[PDB]
Every structure is written in structure tokens, then in C-alpha cells.
Amino acid sequence: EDPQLLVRVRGGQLRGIRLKAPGGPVSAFLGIPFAEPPVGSRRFMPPEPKRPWSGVLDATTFQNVCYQYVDTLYPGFEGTEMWNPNRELSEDCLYLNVWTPYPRPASPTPVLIWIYGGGFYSGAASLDVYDGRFLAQVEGAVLVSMNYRVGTFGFLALPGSREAPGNVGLLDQRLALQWVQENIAAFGGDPMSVTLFGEXAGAASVGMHILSLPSRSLFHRAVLQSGTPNGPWATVSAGEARRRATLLARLVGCNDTELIACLRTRPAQDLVDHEWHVLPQESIFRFSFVPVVDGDFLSDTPEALINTGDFQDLQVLVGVVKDEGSYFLVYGVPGFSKDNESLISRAQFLAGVRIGVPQASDLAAEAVVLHYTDWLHPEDPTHLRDAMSAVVGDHNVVCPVAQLAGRLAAQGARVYAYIFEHRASTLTWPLWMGVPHGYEIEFIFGLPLDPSLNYTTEERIFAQRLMKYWTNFARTGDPNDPRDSKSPQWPPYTTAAQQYVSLNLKPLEVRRGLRAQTCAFWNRFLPKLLSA
Amino acid sequence: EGREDPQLLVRVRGGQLRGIRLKAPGGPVSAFLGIPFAEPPVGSRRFMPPEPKRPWSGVLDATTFQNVCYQYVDTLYPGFEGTEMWNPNRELSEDCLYLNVWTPYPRPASPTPVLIWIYGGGFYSGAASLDVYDGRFLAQVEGAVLVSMNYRVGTFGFLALPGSREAPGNVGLLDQRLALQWVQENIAAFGGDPMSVTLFGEXAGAASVGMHILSLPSRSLFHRAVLQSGTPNGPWATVSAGEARRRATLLARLVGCNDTELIACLRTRPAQDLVDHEWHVLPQESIFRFSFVPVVDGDFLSDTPEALINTGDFQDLQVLVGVVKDEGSYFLVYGVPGFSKDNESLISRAQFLAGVRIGVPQASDLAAEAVVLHYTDWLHPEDPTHLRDAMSAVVGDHNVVCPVAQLAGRLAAQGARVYAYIFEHRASTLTWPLWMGVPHGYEIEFIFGLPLDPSLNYTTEERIFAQRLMKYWTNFARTGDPNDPRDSKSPQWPPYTTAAQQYVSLNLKPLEVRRGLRAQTCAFWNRFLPKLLSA
């Protein structure tokens, strides 16, 4: 009975496991319950705190993944399976994990809380690419990750109702943050230095915590990687969420109370079977059950809340990858597949645009097509293919990121921005997808430090730089190595200068204006066009 | 006769002409100036198509430029050469339908290719007698036969009651065609080859040339066409029949006047009255819009230029087209607040947004916001130098550069051999401020070879450059090809094609070949902006 591996939290005692990191041991506490399992009458409802337990709870193993759709576009392909659930599915999944240094830190240590992506429909805190052993060993970070409910279970809302109020997946996360405040000290974490970070839907969740008052007391700093609370995919209106809920109930055989009561009597897979049948249009980068503008968790739309918020004492790190859009094309855009080069025709591109920008009128779609056509080479397949990617990535990620960056900075926040440009040598997707959405995660988490993974020596050094940027940011609100001249320095993003850095194998390079012309098209012109 | 220079007596269909022996740098040339080609379009003939000049008796003196067609005289900058060079340099009179001929001296052995110049002036001004249209250099150096005509401008040329007998519209274009007809019948008298007639013109002149391409009875009068900074398609060169009816009636009201009674009343008004009100008829506050212009009449123009270029067969057409670097700058001092020749014209964002309303006067609120969106540099949205330059770009692109690209594109896709250029050399003698770059109309003096006159203070490099451009224009006139068939060493000018979009820079340096005529930005004006109107 190793005493480093034994901790008393508010609900009782836990026993972790000593895990091996390349440069030494770390203590891991996996599968710690933070909530009553949200099952039976507790489906669709806010989480309640986990009841105290007797003896020593075994926290040496990952708990179940929250019940979710499993992807089957390319069966047994590492590029898709890496995002698939790697534990048993269950509605009983409200568990979090903690990695700390071994031995447990002497003074209070900055805490990093990870929130996975997966479009609010999938994900789990147990995937290899979120392995917190490296950050804990190399940087001495106390790293926390939680599971939160996704799909119907997390986000089916009949707004205004008592028994399916929406945003419960977000409340799951809020609960895990509360859990960190009350217990992290026992692990040697500093409840007074908590940095959130997440990617895609995880990023949007961080954004939503920024925009929800009761969450603000629970962290001091945020990182938003390739995602935002604002924009086309991360929220729906009360109206649209009611509509989708109602439609899913009809689809399965089911006054709000009676509707929910019926839905609650349904095997989990029955709900998932019909998850994808409630979208208004054939579309990519669009997800059926996502956070809802409820006037509660979210008091107004994210756009409203970011336009009018006050962000004086807030530090934010935001960024994107080089090819935010490529990934999604294979999942519904004719002419795109991982198996050839996906050189498309002009006709395929106009059709691709109606699917990538599903909310677009014929005129708006036209505006898009005309903007993204390279008129010197109007019918070149390579251009059209890359254009299709660009449309999707810009519309869904890069422009909402630019917009968030701008508002946050204008409204008193300290903002650092990046573009991640290094393609992993080990990447199993074809060359044309470039640096796809999600493939910086492995680097921030420090996986190249595992020599058994065959990342290049340069990549191992690159990963170390990034862990340093992120943990420096958690420590100080500033990603710059504070005991190190010569970098050059990562400048704050501002509305005037619009400076951001490239993250790749070469040293930091400062650039200005993050797709400024094209994002001006998306952020300033398309709104006017649609609303008229 | 008896004592006169034998080389200066020429007979044409209407009688006998005495010309003048002029000095050019390399030697003498013959000039026949003020040859009448129409009956004076005076009194009851105002607004009416031109009638061919009736034969005269005796030897008509053809030794001086004739009257300039009645027109608005610019007084924006009184005393200033930059504006005066464009102003009339002979008496204003409705009796103005005369043309001019320059030929080598002595007149050439074999039939020489003919170049016919049509001046610009927004269809409200111009004159073939201006110093920058002097044909002596092309005649002396290139051996060209050069012909330029006066045609009626403003109300006298373009005021129209579409459908009426007494003011059918487009009569200024008919003046031009009459002079093309005179060239066919008579040019051989001067050594010119009526089977090798090339039209060339700038701004409204360019637009005029294009309209002769698009109008069948003019098609048999020429073989090749040069269009400088102007197109028959675009937002300024034509009006709908309805719009012309509107402007004509309003002008009538303003001066004190079916259509017979109205036009008869207009005919009793003095010319200067009509000029005094011609600017009061425009639908919005604007620049690069002109009151009385060619009308889409279903006759001269059987349909809109845009329709005719989209669907015409231009198989045997050789066309040279181009623009200057700064098409829009000139126009800004004529009514965009914040702009002037006397300072740097650094402007605010507010002045930019207002400028766009004046520059794109036909644009709705949404279209105007699209323009502003597109031309704003989002790194430096408040920067005065960029805003000043973008104001210029907006006007240049909308009125000239994108109309030209549209034209070049459609013509090429449909049989034409098209050569395309961008002229980028600012004259060392230019009197306009530096911010205006290479303004509209400032290539003319080079094509015409004024730098060859030692007394004009152009640089040596400018003389050489002038000669180059003269070679290009007159080679194109001769062969449909601007290139030199001998000198294959020095760089080649490729045709412009839809696949490759090739054009050349014209400056002091040798030819450089570029791709895409503002391809991204012109997609906005030519493809998107129209669609933001079917809505």
C-alpha cells in the first residue's frame, strides 16, 4: 500500500496506480465518480453530486465511456478508431481522472482541466491522445479530465420543461469543475490556478463556461483549440432543440412530461439509432444534440454574450490547425474519400458548398462559391478540392475563432492566438487532408515523448515546446518562457495588430490577421445577405 | 493651281482639297484638316441623323482644324494644363462635322493601312484637333494614314426620344459611321487602303469602337479594332430607351419645353442653354456617369452590349484592349468629397463609404456594403492611404477594368483574336499629383508619339518607349498582331485566352507577361454583383 497512491477526497478514500512515464513515475487516479450515475429517472436531467462511499474506492482504471454513437465509416482504420470509445459504453459514465507527479507535489500546482471534443455527440476522457501522464511527469502539472454526457443523453432539451431542461452535458462538466475546487488540493493541485482547455466541442464548452456566470468562479484561464461557443454548429435555439427532441420521440414511438417519461423507457441504443435523423438538411459539421440557448446556462446567444461581455481579468489562448475542414469532407461530400486524392469537379464543388454551408440560401451559396473559386484556375480539381476544405474549416472554425479573438480582445481580455501547421509523421490520413482537425492534440499532450510510438526526434522536441507553451500559459496567463530571452516572443492578439504565431517545427513566426479578408466575408457580409 | 505643292492637291467625292505640308521630327507629312463629311447638323437638323456632305465647288482649304462640336467646357481647375489639354481648342459650333487626314509625304507608293481615331470625353466632350491626337508622328514615322473625325457630343449627339422621328438617339455614333463611310470611298485618294482600316479610341472613343463592332452596318467599314480604357458594355456607356426618354424630357422641362412638339421646342433653344442644363438630369449624385450617351434603341444597338457580346460571333475579329494602372483616380476630384489635385487626398473611413455611394451610384445599400467589404483592407481598415487608393480602385474597376475583362473574356471565348495590355508608365511631364498614379487618358500621348517632339521635355527613355508603342499599334493595324515578325528575340505578346488570361505590361522595361486581369476582384463585379440585383 504505497501512500502516494492513497488520497482522501470529500466523498471518501481512493487508491490510484503508479504509472510509468518515459522520464519517471506518475500517480494516476482514474474513474473517480463525480456524480450519481445519471440513469433511470435521471436520464436528461442535471447531475447530482456523488454520495459518499465506504472504505477505499479503486481508482486505478478508466471508467465507462458515456453512451454514444460509434463511428463506422472506415472499420479498423487507426485514423478513425483513435476517436472511438476504448472502454464499455454506459449511461453510467460520470467519472473523472487525475494525473499528478510522483511524488505528489510539495506546493500547490497549477491544474489543467481537459474537456474532449466529439461534436457533443461522442468522445471520452480515456482515449490515448488525452493521456495526461506526460504533462504530469515532464511539467509537474496536475491534470484533470472528466467524462460528460453526449448526444441525446447530454443535450436533448425540451426547453422550459422540468424533466429535460437541456445543457446537462455542460452541467456535468460544471460539476467536475466544482469537484476540482473542493478536492484537488488533496492531490496537491491549486484550486486557485485552474486552466480549462479542450478541442472542437471541448473548445466550445470552454467558451460556454466563459459565458456562464456560475462557471466563472471555477477557473481562471481558458484554452480553446479549434472551436468556439459562437458560430454555426455549437448552439441551437430553444425552438430548434424542441423540434429535434419532438422529432426523435416521434421516430421512436413517443405534453413534455409524458414525452420525456416515454423517452426514458427506451434502451440507450434506440435513441442513438435515430440521433442522425433529426437534422433539417443534408450537412457536414452539424450535430443533432448540442447546447441550447435556454436563457439559463446561456442567458442569450453566444454572439450576443461575446459582443456585450466584460472580460477584464481573463486570459485566453485560442487557435486553429492548418486544414480545419478536410476531415469532415469524407463524411458526406460526394467526391471525397481518404482512399484516393479526391480531385473534384466544379459541379461537385457547388454541390459540396450546399452541404458544407447547409443554412445557405442560393444567393449566399453563390457568394461563397464565387469567393472561393480561384478565378485564374476556375476548374482546376486540386484548387476546387482545397477550396471545399477551406469553406468548411473557415465557416465552422477559423472565422468563428477570429471573431471570438476579436471580441475577447476588444473587451479587455488577454488573448494569445496560434495556427498549428505540423503534420504528424505517423498520420494515417492521406496527404491531401494536410494537418487535419484534431491532430495537434497528440502533440500538446506530449505523446511523442513515448519512444515506442516512432515520432521523429524533431517531433519530440516540438511536443516539448508545446507542453511548455500550454503549461506556461496555465501558470501565468502568458505562454512565453519567462526565464528565457531569445524566442522570439509570442505577442498578445489585439484588434489593431491582429498578431498570432505559427506552431510548427521551425521557431515561432509572428503573422498578422487571421484570414482577415475571408473572415470579413463570413463575419460581416454573409449575415447581412441571409437576413434580407 | 500653278504654283502650289503638287503633293497637297487631292480630289475626293465632294470636290477638291488643298492640304498642308507639316513638320514632324523625322521630316515632312501631309495634312488635310477640316474636311467636311456631313451637312452641318444645324437648325432643323439638330438631333437628326447626319446627312452626307453635298459636293462643293472650288478648292476647299483643308489647312486648319475646324470647329469643335458644341460642348461643356471644364472649369474645375482654371489655368491648369492637366485639365486644359482636354478642353476645346477651336471655336464651339453646332457646325462641327469635319474630319482630318495625315499621310506620309510624299503620299505612299502602295496602299497603306489606315488608322481611324475616335476621341473620348464621356460622350459630352472631345475634339479630334487636340494636341494629344496629332497624327503627324504616326504618319511620319510609321508611314500610317491616320484619320480622326469630330462627332456630336452631349445633347446634340445623344439626346433621344426613342421611337420618335425627330430625335432617334445615337446620332453621334451615326456621325462616326458616316466618317467611316467617307474613309471607304475616299481614302484611296490619299494612299490609304480601304481594305485595311483599324479603329482605335480611348474611353467613350473605346466604347464607340466597341459599338461599331456590335452594330452590323458598321462592321463592313473596318477590319480591326483597338479599345483603350473603355468598353461598349459596362455601367456608363449606354442607357435604356426608358432612361434616355426620362433624361430628355427632364432636360426639356428645365429649358422650357407627342415628341414632335417637344423636340421642335428643343430646336428653338440656343446651344448654350442645352449645355447649361445637361448635368442636371442624372438620377443620382455620381462620378463616371454622363447624361446623354448611346441608347439601347433596338436599331444601332439591337440589344444591350452585354447581351450582344455574350452571344455574338466574333470569328474574324482582331481586337487590342487594355487599361491604365490608375483608371479611377482622375474622376475622384470631380465630386468625391475629400479628393483634390492640390493635396494627397488621404481620406477617412466615412469619406470612403460616402465615396462608394457616389462611385457606384446604381448600388443599393447591400451592394454598397459588399463593395466596401471587398475593398477594405481588414488589417488596416482606417488607414487613409489605403482608403484613398481603394476609392480609386473601386471607381477604376467598376467602370473600366472589369468591363474590359468581361469584354476580353467574352470576345476570346467566341472566336476573336484578343491582345490585352495594362499601361503602367506615368509621364515624367504629368501635371497631376503623384497620388493619381497613371490616370485615365495618359497613355494617349505615347501611342501618338508626342515624346518624339524634342521641344516637349520627355526623357530619352520615353522617346524609345513611344516608338515601341507606335510599333505595337501599327503592327496590329497592319497584321492583326502587335508583335514584330522579324525581331523574335525581344519578348512576345501572347493573345489573351480564357484558359490562360495573358496580358502584357507596357512600361519602360521590356514586355512582361501577366495572368488574370484582376481576376478575383472582377469576379465580384461581373459575376456576383449582378446577382445581388435579382434579389
DSSP per-residue letters across A456-486: -HHHHHHHHHHHHHHHHHHHHS--S-SS---
Of A513, A524, A525, the CB nearest to B379: A513
**Cis amide bond preceding A488, omega within 30:** yes
What is the distance in angstroms between the Cα of B265 and the nearest Cα belonging to chain A? 47
Going by the DSSP 8-state scheme, the letter that residue B128 receives in this structure is: T
Question: Chain A contacts of B501, Cβ < 8 Å?
Answer: 376
DSSP states of A153-208: HHH-B-TT-SS-BS-HHHHHHHHHHHHHHHHGGGGTEEEEEEEEEEETHHHHHHHH
Of A370, A524, A528, the CB nearest to B528: A370
Three-state secondary-structure class, residue A295: coil
Nearest chain A residue to B529 by CA: give it: A367
**Residues in chain B whose Cβ is within 8 Å of chain A:** 366, 369-370, 373, 376, 378-379, 501, 515-516, 519-520, 522-524, 527-528, 531-532, 535
Q: Which domains does chain A have, with CATH numbers?
A: 1-532 (3.40.50.1820)
Q: Does B378 sit within 8 Å of A520, measured CB to CB?
A: yes
Three-state secondary-structure class, residue B162: coil
What is the distance in angstroms between the Cα of A528 and the nearest Cα belonging to chain B? 8
B203 belongs to the catalytic site: yes
Other Cβ atoms less than 10 A from the Cβ of B256: the count is: 10
Judge contact between A151 and A180, C-beta under 8 A: no
Closest-CA residue to B192 (of B76, B259, B104, B133): B104
Strands A236-237 and B224-228: unpaired
Three-state secondary-structure class, residue B107: coil
Selecting among A139, A324, A421, A440, the annotated active-site residue is A324
Of B370, B378, B523, the CB nearest to A517: B378
Other Cβ atoms less than 10 A from the Cβ of A485: the count is: 7
Residue the block writes with cell 458526406 = A332
Backbone angles phi and psi of B263, in degrees to 5? -65, -40
A139 belongs to the catalytic site: no
Closest-CA residue to A381 (of A355, A348, A429): A348
First to last CA, chain A: 69
- Rounded distance between C-alpha atoms, residue B332 and residue A15, angstroms: 78
- Rounded distance between C-alpha atoms, residue B45 and residue B51, angstroms: 9
Closest-CA residue to B143 (of B118, B99, B170, B113): B113
Q: Is B383 exposed, middle or buried (0-12, 13-18, 19+ CB in 10 A)?
A: middle
**Helix (H) or strand (E) segment spanning residue B11:** strand B9-12
Three-state secondary-structure class, residue B27: strand
Resolution, Å (one decimal): 2.6
Judge contact between A493 and A415, C-beta under 8 A: yes
Residue ranges of alpha helices (H) inside B278-324 are: 305-311
Of A376, A517, A525, the CB nearest to B515: A376
List of residues 6+ apart from A486 with CB closer than 8 A: none
**Cell of residue A12, nine digits:** 471518501
Question: Chain B contacts of A367, Cβ < 8 Å?
Answer: 528
Q: Does B379 sit within 8 Å of A525, measured CB to CB?
A: no
Given 3-state DSSP classes, what are the helix, strand and coil percentages for chain B, each rounded to the nearest 5? Answer: 40, 20, 45
List of residues 6+ apart from B245 with CB closer than 8 A: B160, B161, B162
Q: Is A182 exposed, middle or buried (0-12, 13-18, 19+ CB in 10 A)?
A: middle
Please name the amino acid found at residue B449.
Answer: G
List of residues 6+ apart from A293 with CB closer than 8 A: A235, A236, A237, A238, A300, A301, A302
Which technique was the structure solved with, according to the deposited record? Answer: X-ray
- Rounded distance between C-alpha atoms, residue A245 and residue A261, angstroms: 13
- Rounded distance between C-alpha atoms, residue A236 and residue A244, angstroms: 10
> Could you give the angle at the alpha carbon of B276 between the alpha carbons of B270 and B282, nearest 5°?
125
Residue the block writes with cell 456607356 = B237
Please name the amino acid found at residue B124.
Answer: Y
Strands B68-69 and B92-93: parallel
DSSP β-bridge partners for residue B102: B31, B146
